[PDB]
Amino acid sequence: MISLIAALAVDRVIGMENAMPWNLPADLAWFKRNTLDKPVIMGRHTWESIGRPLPGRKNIILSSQPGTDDRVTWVKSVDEAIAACGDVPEIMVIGGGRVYEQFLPKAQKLYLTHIDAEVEGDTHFPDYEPDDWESVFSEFHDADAQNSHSYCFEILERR
Ligand SMILES: Nc1nc(=O)c2nc(CNc3ccc(C(=O)N[C@@H](CCC(=O)O)C(=O)O)cc3)cnc2[nH]1
């Protein structure tokens, strides 16, 4: 089953110029937790921002151009991407924006981190119709010495 994980700022802003503006240690932790051991899907842009392969997970890169790195798996389509995933309990769709757009409809569960902070960006997380989603988990966090802003981790499962 497919899951979308994503870090959202105010206004569903997800990123700016291929990078995550803010600095939130608690977010990386969580991200790493829910991703580790599962395949991860991502776009070319996201691949690039990342720089190298996420350890402990199979990297699936979705692009219309040939790969150019044999350490990761390159696929040209949403279906291909899923086949490459094999039969596993969970697939992790990590963005960018376009990607996430492609997978929402297939997605069953959403892993969201709402960040309290105004950033101007160029990308947004798709607008998903609340009505169809059920929040099964929530956890707020006041800012701190490591995390410069307050945040919320949230888990949403389709109805
Ligand atoms: N919730 C959420 N948080 C994010 O930070 C986020 N980032 C991406 C994509 N960009 C990136 C860029 C770098 C690393 C990264 O180095 N991840 C490490 C965490 C390091 C740690 O263990 O604390 C990893 O390998 O999991 C992750 C995502 C996608 N969804 C997100 N979704």
Ligand SMILES: [Mn+2]
């Ligand atoms: Mn139900």
